[PDB]
Amino acid sequence: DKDVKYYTLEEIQKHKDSKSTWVILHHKVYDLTKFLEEHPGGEEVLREQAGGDATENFEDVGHSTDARELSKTYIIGELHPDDRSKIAKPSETL
Ligand code: HEM
Numbered sequence: 001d002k003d004v005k006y007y008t009l010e011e012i013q014k015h016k017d018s019k020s021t022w023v024i025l026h027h028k029v030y031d032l033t034k035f036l037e038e039h040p041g042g043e044e045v046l047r048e049q050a051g052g053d054a055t056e057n058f059e060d061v062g063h064s065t066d067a068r069e070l071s072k073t074y075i076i077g078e079l080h081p082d083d084r085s086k087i088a089k090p091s092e093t094l
Contacts, residue, residue, distance in 0.1 A: 004028070005077035012077075016051030022076055025055040027084070029077040056094045 015022035
C-alpha cells in the first residue's frame with residue numbers, strides 16, 4: 001500500500017549524484033531520479049537541490065494541488081527520528 005524507510009540525513013545526502021536524485025521535503029524523503037526530465041519546471045533546479053532541502057524552494061513557489069498527490073508517488077522514505085529531534089535549524093528560511 002505504502003511504507004516509508006526512515007533514512008538519515010547522511011544516507012539521503014549520499015543519494016544526490018548520478019542515479020539517486022533524492023531530496024528532503026517538509027520532513028520526509030522523495031526520489032526525483034526518473035522525475036528529473038518529466039518535472040514540468042526543469043531538471044537543473046532539482047539537481048541543484050538534490051540531497052538538500054528543496055521544500056524551502058518549492059513552498060515559495062506553491063506547487064499545484066495535483067503535485068500534492070503525485071508527491072506521494074515520488075515519496076521514498078521519512079526523515080529519520082534521530083536527526084528529527086535536532087533539525088539543527090537552518091535558522092530561517094523560506
Ligand atoms: C525538489 C523540489 C522541487 C523544486 C525545487 C521544484 C521547483 C519547480 C519549479 C521552479 C517549477 C516551475 C515553476 C514556474 O515555471 O513558474 C516547478 C513546476 C512544477 N513542479 Fe516542481 N519542484 C520540486 C519538486 C516537485 C515534485 C516532487 C513534483 C511532483 C509532485 C513537482 C511537480 C511540479 C509541477 C506539476 C509543476 C508545474 C507547475 C505549473 O506550471 O502549473 N515538483 N517546480
